[PDB]
């Protein structure tokens, strides 16, 4: 077969804000990806930006707890119907042969018990890789640092299991969920590498 | 010949404790492993999974010295006979035609001066790259998060030099050899790049 | 086509500096370093080694602010004539027919205004991802911890933008511009992944 498969989904401009974050606060928001992928012989390599903008986001709740949010998960699926809770399109696979279950990662080794999928749960993982990025941000939007705990995750919907790549945002500082505050946040790129779950 | 090359060797379960890690007092310890490497046209990939169990390690001494480690070193090798600190197993390599040498890592051009292989030596890199994971933790083991150093490392065997991949895992709290404890860690997966010494 | 193409530039040895660094007192020093980079079906991988000896580097001002300097940016770049400020000497490509606009990364998605190139500014990026490194360190240098900042840069020349692949390294301590100090300074391999500007 082809040795080697890819996957591009999102906007590529980060200005269209069809995909879904959930904060500690259980607070859900829109927000804008651009996800690059890989699959080279059973290595899945993952390049992801992320942007929140006050403007498309939604509404944030004021309440002390809500305003305080540092944390957000965003989840990259393969499984664009069956367990997508953060809302990945419909992208560009090449070559024309290759689908989107050529993009799912293996089963994380130190991981058993599953998420229970929700379409607005949050999801916090506390196990994993540590990575730190400094974001670009406009506006009062002033997070600081963003750590990000990235990896992939078991997660039940309706008796099956599905393994998605679970990436944990997290800022230094309460700034991006308090409705007093207007501006936009960039990360990226991100890039993470696992094992795949197939060969293309 | 063939662009890419895949090695995997170890346990997919981690229920099998058959290779060696020796902490920082010097005391060697089985432990499990899951091992999948990549030689993408002379790009070594490697991702690790490491397990330790209380019930299958082995003796921790008590003394106050031994109870309070809190760094081993663990060895990934592609000398299975002839330098293999940490045991290793024999593995699936594709394609057929492709052999272990094919994921020997470049030599490291930061370092020459070579570590003197032992069974059970302690080498402890003080140079390289460092990652942060958050184990997976069972039991009363609470070692925190664990730094990794890893790098590869010039090696020294009967005259003969060898490069291998080295990772120092760094507990934040002493737990784990501490006699008194029983409990379980899993950390991964550990990704690490660098250059391959040939092409596959 | 050819999916996968290398390149490789620089001194094997780490002995010859004729490469550029400028710090962040805005002194330019002479450098040496090893590249080796693939494209991988529009995946870019950059491994980087870099050396500084106080014997070969140039002149270290003295006045408080230069010897205090602990930051530098190395710049790498696939445009070797047109917008090279760390002056990347030819290399080799993989296979004959690839060229270096095979190495361009894409556009960062975070950044839009570009750098003002130069042939000796010093350029501070203070955005996007943080790796940490021990270095290599002979004689009176003690730089202690490399912090590294990486990210694809967009940099303006003759009305031309390019993008390169920008490296901040930051010193723990105040040592190696300190001209009363001697010694030698290797940080690597660095690797840093990123999506390619096209396909090899």
């Known amino acids: 077969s082809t040795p080697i498969a890819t996957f591009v989904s999102g906007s590529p401009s980060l200005n269209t804000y069809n995909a879904t974050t959930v904060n500690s606060s259980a607070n859900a928001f829109s927000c804008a990806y651009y996800l690059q992928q890989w699959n080279i012989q ?20 004021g309440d002390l707890n809500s305003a305080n949010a540092k944390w957000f998960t965003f989840w990259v699926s393969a499984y664009l119907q069956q367990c997508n809770p953060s809302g990945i399109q419909a992208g560009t696979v090449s070559p024309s042969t290759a689908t989107l279950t ?14 229970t999928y929700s379409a ?3 999801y916090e993982p506390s196990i994993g890789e540590f990575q730190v990025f400094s974001p670009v941000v406009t506006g009062a939007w002033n997070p600081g640092n963003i750590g990000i705990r990235v990896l992939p995750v078991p ?15 997290q800022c230094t500082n309460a ?3 308090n409705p007093n505050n207007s501006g936009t946040m960039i990360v990226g790129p991100v890039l993470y590498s696992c094992p795949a779950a197939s060969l293309p």
């Open 155 to 169: 997660v039940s919907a309706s008796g099956e299991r599905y393994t998605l790549l679970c990436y944990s945002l």
């Open 42 to 61: 059973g290595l899945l390599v993952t390049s992801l930006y992320l942007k929140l903008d006050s403007a498309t986001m939604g509404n944030r709740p």
């Open 102 to 115: 050529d993009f799912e990662p293996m089963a994380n080794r130190s991981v058993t018990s599953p998420w």
């Open 120 to 122: 607005n749960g949050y």
């Open 175 to 177: 700034s991006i969920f």
